[PDB]
Amino acid sequence: GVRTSPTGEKVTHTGQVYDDEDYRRVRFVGRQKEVNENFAIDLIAEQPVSQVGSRVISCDGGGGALGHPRVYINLDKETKTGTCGYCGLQFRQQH
Amino acid sequence: LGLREIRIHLCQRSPGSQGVRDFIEKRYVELKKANPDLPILIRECSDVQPKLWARYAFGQEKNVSLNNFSADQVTRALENVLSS
Amino acid sequence: GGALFVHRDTPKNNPETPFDFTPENYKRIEAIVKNYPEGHKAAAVLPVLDLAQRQNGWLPISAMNKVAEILQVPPMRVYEVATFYTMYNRKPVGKYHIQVCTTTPCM
Amino acid sequence: PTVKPPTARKFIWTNHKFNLSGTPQQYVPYSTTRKKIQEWVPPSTPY
Amino acid sequence: ITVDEKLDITTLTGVPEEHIKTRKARIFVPARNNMQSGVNNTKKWKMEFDTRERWENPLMGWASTADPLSNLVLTFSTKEDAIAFAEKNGWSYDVEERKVPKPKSKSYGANFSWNKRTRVSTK
Amino acid sequence: TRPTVRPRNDVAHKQLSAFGEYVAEILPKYVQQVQVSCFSELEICIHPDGVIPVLTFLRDHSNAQFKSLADLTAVDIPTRQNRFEIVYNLLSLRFNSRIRVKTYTDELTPVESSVSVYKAANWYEREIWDMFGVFFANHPDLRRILTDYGFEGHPFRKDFPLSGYVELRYDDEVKRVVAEPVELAQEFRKFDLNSPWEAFPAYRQPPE
Amino acid sequence: SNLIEVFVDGQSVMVEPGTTVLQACEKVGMQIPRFCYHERLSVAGNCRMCLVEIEKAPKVVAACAMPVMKGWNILTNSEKTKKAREGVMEFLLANHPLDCPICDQGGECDLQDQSMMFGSDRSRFLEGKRAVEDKNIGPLVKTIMTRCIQCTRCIRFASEIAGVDDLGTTGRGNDMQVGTYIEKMFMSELSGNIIDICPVGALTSKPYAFTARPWETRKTESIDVMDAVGSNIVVSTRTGEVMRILPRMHEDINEEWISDKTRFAYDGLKRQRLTEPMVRNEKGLLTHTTWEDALSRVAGMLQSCQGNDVAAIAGGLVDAEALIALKDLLNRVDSDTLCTEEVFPTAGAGTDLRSNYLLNTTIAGVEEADVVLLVGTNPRFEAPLFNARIRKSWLHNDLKVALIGSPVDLTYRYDHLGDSPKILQDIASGSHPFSQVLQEAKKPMVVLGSSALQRNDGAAILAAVSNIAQKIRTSSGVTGDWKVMNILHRIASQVAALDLGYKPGVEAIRKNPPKMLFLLGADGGCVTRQDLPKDCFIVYQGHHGDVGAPIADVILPGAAYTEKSATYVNTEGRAQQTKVAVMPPGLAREDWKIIRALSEIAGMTLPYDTLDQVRNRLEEVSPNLVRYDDVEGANYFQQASELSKLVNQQLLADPLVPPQLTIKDFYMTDSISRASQTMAKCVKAVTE
Amino acid sequence: TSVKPIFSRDMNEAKRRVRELYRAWYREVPNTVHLFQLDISVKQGRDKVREMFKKNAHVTDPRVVDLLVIKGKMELEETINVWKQRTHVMRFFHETEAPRPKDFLSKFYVGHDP
Amino acid sequence: AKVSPPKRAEMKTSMESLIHHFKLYTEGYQVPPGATYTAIEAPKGEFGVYLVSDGSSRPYRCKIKAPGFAHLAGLDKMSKGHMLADVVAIIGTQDIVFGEVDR
Amino acid sequence: RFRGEHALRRYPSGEERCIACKLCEAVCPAQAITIEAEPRADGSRRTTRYDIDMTKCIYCGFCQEACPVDAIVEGPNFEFSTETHEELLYNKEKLLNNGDKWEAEIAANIQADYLYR
């Protein structure tokens, strides 16, 4: 159920939508314009905010040897959610 | 008349350079006091053949060589171009 | 670092928070500054800021900026000195500050 | 697969449809990103 | 051998098409990428060419050209070899002069000096 | 240095040094520089004359044989007063050794007919002509190997870009394959992979 | 004689008494791996990667700050050294994040380079890896401080060169954060340059962001606009776009530094750009059309129109070439009313005699200057780089700087002589304030900014300043061959422009209303359809015109500087040529070729088709403009002095002000900047 | 300046050999154009031959001249035989090269700095 | 670690392994300058590459040696004495691949 | 370890595992890849246009080794025979949808062989 152009094109998770003037749109006549129906960003806000009672924590991003490499993120500032640079799934220190 | 502008080119060190430099030193200031509007102009090193230019009348121009001429010869030359 | 008692920043709450020296205390600060050769006068940042923590149990950032003003030095040096040394507490404490040596033959 | 099951993730296709070559359903490649230089426009008000 | 001593400038017509007339060639010593500090990229003269237009391919948008000579680079030891290969190989050139760091005097003690205006705050 | 490193032998080093030195003693005319790679492969530099005499020697003399020519090649180096290094690489059958013979030429100066020693040089020389353009005096034949008949420009030399100056295609106009100035769909993206810092301190040259 | 023999690997080299170790090894080709040391920044012992062994000496010495006595033998590859380097590299890599995939400098950062080419191949120390709270600073500088190696570069730069003094370190041991303690925004001219100095990915470019990657991009030599310093930049291009622009080392100008506005203007390079020629249809709207159709329309009106009633005025950013082209086109018609946007007073023959016409003492001389006063201007903003070298001199070799005409904020704490041209006039008189220092000065300098000269007092102020240079230079002021009087500029094109004979000021147009007007990148509102009477038929030729394009009767989308390979002139007279980065968007032909085509359709043809012939006649105007990155000193200052003393113009009472004040006027000025959303973002970030 | 000249010491014998070569071509133009069944008139083909000679006419160094002659006798040595199909012999002619505007305001009108 | 990439377990979790990974892919290991000729026994006979390395990441000039490029040049003499129907077998007998010969 | 077609992968709770770090493009021996990465709304970085020419692609496996996070992996499935030279060029989008079509497949392979790499 992606946001749909006035033409009927389905814009993408980086909006590529062609303009009514552009001739190139004709290449979609009779054949489907393919886009992944499941956006990425929409699954980031899907995730809960993990909380740790420690000060500084790790993310393997899904377990050892499969995932992104280790990085320790600093949760010191609690007025924002410290985010992993690979996954994007937030962390906080509980109160 | 007709002269729109007059151009000169010298160099820093060479015989023609010293000659027409002397010309500019003594003669120039009064030459410009004579005619305010004609935009005579001066530039820097052209290694040899310092010469000069004069532009006027729908782009028409004339090209004379100043190579190692006396400040006298330069004087009567520019007075020739200006006079016309 | 990962292991720390408290971080070092000013997040909030004391931009303008009032701090003023006492006139006799200005006399004192003048006496201190007289102990350094002229052309420097920045050497007094540490003793004067000491004094600030002395009359006010803990120094707000307005005290740091204020000392920087008194000595006409760039404040970042004042913050720097305030953080680098142990004596200065940048957060309020009680009237009595208890300190024990846990390291070595005391340990 | 039944004795050792798949991980059953949520975003995987539940169809796995055929082979799209030919037919009105077919993959057509095309440019991504967004325009380039954002051409200027004149004002609609004369003078 | 009958060496047959001969004097003329060497030119070559046994090489590619009319690009020789139009394009000017560039000689330089590439200045260090500033966002790194180190000189080993430098020390070797290079030759690259006047660039030419590139467009967005309507199917994809990769850049594309007719500029067969676009991507060449030729490393030379000394400028005399650059002008030599340019002359000999037949197409016009333009030279840029080499530049170097200017010798400096840094005395650590000058950080702390008594009356001199230079003094390092924070060090 | 024991693990992970190739163990190097000084036996072959001393031997090959002795042999190259020997060649230098016996052929003062043509010999210029005789060096030994620290991985022990003897390499001899030769003025672009004695190729025929030097190789006639290295095929005979009974204290060296080199009955087999390994490979003939060349390297296009600008920056040099002579662009090319004609590299003769020989195989000693009797002694278990290989030595290299380097000679040079510019574009116009030919190298003369190495065929008369080694038959194997027959095609290597032609391939060099077509792909480089070093002319070979009184070769029994000269033709094109590895390139099109109507093709031109001696591709391997760095003056010649990666792609050509032409392409092929077909169109119902002329009912024949034609040529058009090269046009790429993709630019051939260029990369600068050369990092600073001189990873290797030994090979450095004196700055001036 | 004041030279010292010191061995390197047994190879002697003669060096100066007190050059450092690292320099002594530079001389023979050794580059000792390093971090905190930098050519423009004072020495510190922080990085510790510079360690090198000297034989006979038990301890390893740091090559950065160690002076060289006689007879040191410096062994670079001695085992002890290599072990030291492996050690230091290991301790650095101890606490570092793994950001190389996400990190922006991955193709560059010196930890990777020196890590491979020096340090050990395998790490140790499992439990560890401290982290640091990241700190937002500016809109320009994206900041991740976890990657910081705490090498003190950014500090020393901000302090000494930038002069802001707002960066420092707070902490001990593992925990030391480098940056503002109060979370204040740090923004200044030259501030952006800090992202080049940070050796690791700790600091990086916010707008350049994640877009590109070093090995993929094709570097291209180029020059700068928007500043009369003739700054010297290298555009980083990727597959037909401009990713970012890097300062490169030039010794007389920029050093390695660059202005900020330049650095971040590339975003404004492409926003509103004009890709099509446009013609106003009788309906009352401006639409586009075939290129040669518009050329035929303008060609027509120019055919039927002649006499002084036709005009052209250029300004802002234009090459020398197209200035020649238009010059010989309208000269090829009838007469020249041709002008520029600035008013440069011509009474005492300012147009010629380039001695008074530009800044004749190149910046390599300001480091040899002693006493420099300053008439009204804001060098902090106008020509920022120039201010940078001012602070460099003032820093190292002592100076006394006097400012005249307005209190402003400069980093280096100038003397303020007050505000009045009467003060200047009274400096020409023997009145007490200052003016004895000048008599006592060895090599002085006086700089007149063109902006404060734009006032109707221009010839008067210039006259008084020339009087200053007279009373100095005549008797005890001249120390030999040397120059004093000079002027610096804002808009980059004007110097070559007036070198070509253009009459500065818009005055001529206001005197003689044209029936045709040509515009090359002129957004100055001094000329309006309001001024030009009735039916104007004015032609705007430029790139992404915001101003005057709404007034434009005809559009000729001339190319910008990164596209055309053009010629520019810094305020000192160094001719510098730009080179092509990416060919222009849409149609957008080069300027002088547009004027050329216009000529060939006109009943008069310019005598050339090609850039080489172009630059040939360019030499036939002035010879200097074909000599590149080479400045040559002029002469004949005195003659211009007596030409100045000839006319009397009273000095108005209005106290001057630099048109730029504080930081808010630094960005959106210069009319390419008004494109970039970046400059808008930093502006409204400062206004908060 | 030393040299090892190839087949000729001076430009004289060079001019001689190129005269020879042009004789050969002017011999074998009809036999080829009839041989691969080209559509060109012999006159036209010959004119393109002499054109291709005239293109290089400005050369001086007889080393270069002699080398070019080697090129010529080489290509002619391929056309005298069948080794080259109808394709390339036509490829000397340019039918499918679109006409390139050589006049300025047409070039400017399109090519944007060719 | 600087010649060949580390395995992923060491790649992750360890810094220097990561760096040498990243650079060893982007730039690739640098090879000191030198000229080598190596020869092995390949099923078509002696095969070899002559490497020429500027001190750099990339190679510079490397000409392989195709045994077929030699053996093929021998058909002139070898086939001189037998009619074409066995010139078939003359070509096919010496192991040859026209993908290797050309290069 | 077999090498099929070029599926992109994502984390559990799919993040578009690709970081944009350009490596897979940098080691491509056919040079055929394209990556242009604009930081998106969240501030994290992904790719705008990630492309492949399966024509040019030699099916090395290098882009499978170089990816630090194992974003791109050579698929098990060889499913091909397109009717046009157009259809063999892949957008980031087609590679995603290829990744969604089978993962637990690729998850089984990677989970099997990651001990070897």
Ligand code: SF4
């Ligand atoms: S700062 Fe350097 S070593 Fe650290 S992640 Fe960035 S590129 Fe890698």
Ligand code: SF4
């Ligand atoms: S922020 Fe960068 S320049 Fe400053 S100390 Fe850290 S690593 Fe050095």
Ligand code: SF4
């Ligand atoms: S397998 Fe294909 S995409 Fe991957 S590196 Fe090789 S050619 Fe490039």
Ligand code: SF4
């Ligand atoms: S190597 Fe992996 S994370 Fe990096 S750009 Fe390629 S697919 Fe994306």
Ligand code: FES
């Ligand atoms: S340069 Fe000597 S410590 Fe960094």
Ligand SMILES: [Zn+2]
């Ligand atoms: Zn994560």
